[PDB]
Amino acid sequence: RQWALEDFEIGRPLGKGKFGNVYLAREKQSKFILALKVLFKAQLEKAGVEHQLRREVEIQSHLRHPNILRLYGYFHDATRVYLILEYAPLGTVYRELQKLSKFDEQRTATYITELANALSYCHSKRVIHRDIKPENLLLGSAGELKIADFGWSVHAPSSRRTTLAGTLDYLPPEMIEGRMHDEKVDLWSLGVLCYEFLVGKPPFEANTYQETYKRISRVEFTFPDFVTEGARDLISRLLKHNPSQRPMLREVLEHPWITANSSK
Amino acid sequence: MARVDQTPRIATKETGESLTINCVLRDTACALDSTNWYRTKLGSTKEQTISIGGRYSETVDEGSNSASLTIRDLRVEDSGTYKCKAIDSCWLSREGAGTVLTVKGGAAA
Numbered sequence: 001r002q003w004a005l006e007d008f009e010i011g012r013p014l015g016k017g018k019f020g021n022v023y024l025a026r027e028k029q030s031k032f033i034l035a036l037k038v039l040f041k042a043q044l045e046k047a048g049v050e051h052q053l054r055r056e057v058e059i060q061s062h063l064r065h066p067n068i069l070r071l072y073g074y075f076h077d078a079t080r081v082y083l084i085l086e087y088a089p090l091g092t093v094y095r096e097l098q099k100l101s102k103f104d105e106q107r108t109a110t111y112i113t114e115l116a117n118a119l120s121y122c123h124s125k126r127v128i129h130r131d132i133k134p135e136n137l138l139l140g141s142a143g144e145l146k147i148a149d150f151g152w153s154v155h156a157p158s159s160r161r162t163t164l165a166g167t168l169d170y171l172p173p174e175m176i177e178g179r180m181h182d183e184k185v186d187l188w189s190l191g192v193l194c195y196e197f198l199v200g201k202p203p204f205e206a207n208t209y210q211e212t213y214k215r216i217s218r219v220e221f222t223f224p225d226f227v228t229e230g231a232r233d234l235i236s237r238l239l240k241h242n243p244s245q246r247p248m249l250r251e252v253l254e255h256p257w258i259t260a261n262s263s264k
Numbered sequence: 265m266a267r268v269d270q271t272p273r274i275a276t277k278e279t280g281e282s283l284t285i286n287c288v289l290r291d292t293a294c295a296l297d298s299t300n301w302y303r304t305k306l307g308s309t310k311e312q313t314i315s316i317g318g319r320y321s322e323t324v325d326e327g328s329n330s331a332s333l334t335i336r337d338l339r340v341e342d343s344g345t346y347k348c349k350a351i352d353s354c355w356l357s358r359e360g361a362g363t364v365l366t367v368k369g370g371a372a373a
């Protein structure tokens with residue numbers, strides 16, 4: 001593999017991941033600033049996810065969209081794998097939500113527009129994304145979000161059961177109840193994120209696994225009084241137990257509440 | 265001297281027929297266990313993922329370092345260039361040289 005560590009100057013850590021750290025870096029010839037994600041092979045192998053990562057990195061290499069984090073390339077040495085990534089200078093949406101507590105309708109509708117645009121592009125490339133979490137949404141220099149999780153699928157439908165994530169909070173009912181799933185997961189994700197952006201917490205959050213499982217399966221959620229009628233309409237249309245009843249992405253992008261509030 | 269051998273390099277089929285494309289990673293102990301399939305339709309510039317399901321199916325033969333893609337009930341729309349692409353167990357990029365598929369006849373009609 002042709003890139004090598006000696007091609008890069010390394011700067012401060014950008015953060016720590018499950019399998020290594022991510023650093024700010026620049027390529028020596030062009031001085032182009034980027035992020036270098038370092039993963040230890042032995043840790044990937046320990047967790048038994050190295051094969052899956054190779055599948056995902058290959059898929060990611062083809063995706064070129066302003067709201068999808070760009071993978072520029074990769075390389076390896078005896079102990080590590082290096083991913084050469086687009087540097088996102090404004091951090092995660094997760095952190096932004098921590099700082100602001102809740103987003104207003106303009107910021108929310110604009111973010112939902114960016115996600116729907118990204119997901120539309122993905123459909124045109126026939127790749128499926130799985131659940132979307134705020135900690136895996138990064139922010140570019142102009143404040144535009146970037147899907148950063150490499151969580152792609154090429155089986156429609158899929159019976160897959162990744163990821164042993166943190167909670168169930170971002171998973172659709174078909175994924176937690178053990179049924180087949182496909183592109184319609186997209187719309188559930190948009191509903192969960194739209195709610196979380198406006199309210200400050202995802203709609204099925206609970207103190208126990210049991211209660212969260214039940215609320216997702218039953219689609220048990222309520223709105224604080226300040227959530228407006230248009231937001232309620234969109235979110236309620238998105239969070240359908242039956243995936244086939246969820247809207248098309250075009251319907252999200254054309255929803256009156258989105259077009260009224262989105263800056264894009 | 266590792267090479268991916270993709271066959272057939274050229275295929276002409278009639279509508280309703282089936283096509284199997286094979287990709288084999290030869291002359292290396294590196295394993296081809298992670299193959300994805302891609303297509304650029306004839307006349308188009310957009311490469312697309314071949315999503316598995318419906319008319320599209322795929323197999324892997326770990327013992328022979330191979331992978332296959334089968335398209336059944338071929339349609340004129342299926343005409344285009346097809347490639348297997350993977351990152352092998354040695355973290356090295358592998359791609360087949362491609363299958364140029366032409367679907368002509370046999371009834372439109």
Ligand SMILES: Nc1ncnc2c1ncn2[C@@H]1O[C@H](COP(=O)(O)OP(=O)(O)O)[C@@H](O)[C@H]1O
Pocket residue numbers: 014015016017018019022035037069085086087088089091092138
């Ligand atoms: N491309 C990037 N640009 C800027 N910051 C990043 C980038 N990738 C990761 N980070 C930061 O590095 C931290 C490590 O995250 P990540 O690589 O997503 O870990 P994991 O592999 O455990 O998901 C993240 O919290 C994020 O804040």
